[PDB]
């Protein structure tokens, strides 16, 4: 078991794991992925076993208010995905604590995350990772003019 | 009739409208107030009629990702409150309007807002201001160490 930060050579591995986490086009993924590698407050970790990417974790540092938090800035889990076969092997636990370490570096005392209201699978994963539910919100949007 | 930005001369009027939107002590309100005034990315509008303050609006500019939005940065409604007697004036609409113009200076094309899942009368208020629901989200938090 090995954990590496994502890079340009890690791009293909990252993508196909990212492909399963979020629903988007390949073009949008790779565009989002490229700009994350050049971000100061963005964490991309890849987990390896037998030289094969089996899981991934993306996180960031949030300076703007996160719903449910009491400090700022805070660590934020953008998403974490583990291959359906290498699940139940405690790799998500491994990735998440190294994310906490990374965020601890920036003197963060609090790690936050969000899930859709109906994604019970992710809700369970969060509870297994040490998170407690804070609040539930409804988001709105509107075009200017 | 007259909409004016909050000022240090209008703290008390701003205060009496803000506490009934966020329950908190006067000392702590005033402290966040004094910082918002000095914050370039924050907006504080007071609505006047009959020489009294009947409504208030607070908004900000978000560069970090906001649930449901498609662009960045975005304008973000922090809170809007109108005196019960004046909730048929269109004052809220005008306030939103003046907030969107403000967000235009930062090249925002989207205006986002959030609300408690249980606050159903706030959802109606958003909908009557042109806001459309985007995502329902549950948040999590976890202390580092
Ligand atoms: Cl996730
Ligand atoms: Cl989700
Ligand atoms: Cl009233
Ligand atoms: Mg999330
Ligand atoms: Mg809100």
UniProtKB/Swiss-Prot annotation, chains A, B:
Gene Ontology molecular functions: aminoglycoside 6'-N-acetyltransferase activity
Catalytic activity: kanamycin B + acetyl-CoA = N(6')-acetylkanamycin B + CoA + H(+)
Binding site for substrate: 22, 65, 78, 114, 135
Record-level GO BP terms: response to antibiotic
InterPro entries for the chain: Acyl_CoA_acyltransferase, Aminoglycoside_N6-AcTrfrase, GNAT_dom, YpeA/RimI_acetyltransf
Keyword terms of this UniProt record: Acyltransferase, Antibiotic resistance, Transferase
Subunit record text: Homodimer.
Cited NCBIfam families: AAC_6p_Acine (NF000224), AAC_6p_group_E (NF043067)
Name by which UniProt lists this protein: Aminoglycoside N(6')-acetyltransferase type 1
Organism (species): Acinetobacter haemolyticus
């Amino acid at each position: 078991m090995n954990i590496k930060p994502a890079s340009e050579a890690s791009l293909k591995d990252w993508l196909e794991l990212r492909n399963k986490l979020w629903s988007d086009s390949e073009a949008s993924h790779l565009q989002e992925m490229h700009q994350l590698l050049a971000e100061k407050y963005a964490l991309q970790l890849l987990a390896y076993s037998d030289h094969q990417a089996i899981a991934m974790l993306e996180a960031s540092i949030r300076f703007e208010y996160v719903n449910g938090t009491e400090t700022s800035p805070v660590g934020f889990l953008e998403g974490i995905y583990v291959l359906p076969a290498h699940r139940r092997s405690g790799v998500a636990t491994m990735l998440i604590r190294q994310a906490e370490v990374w965020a601890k570096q920036f003197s963060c005392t609090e790690f936050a995350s969000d899930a859709a209201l109906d994604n019970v699978i992710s809700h369970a994963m969060h509870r297994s990772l040490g998170f407690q539910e804070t609040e539930k919100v409804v988001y709105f949007s509107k075009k200017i003019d």
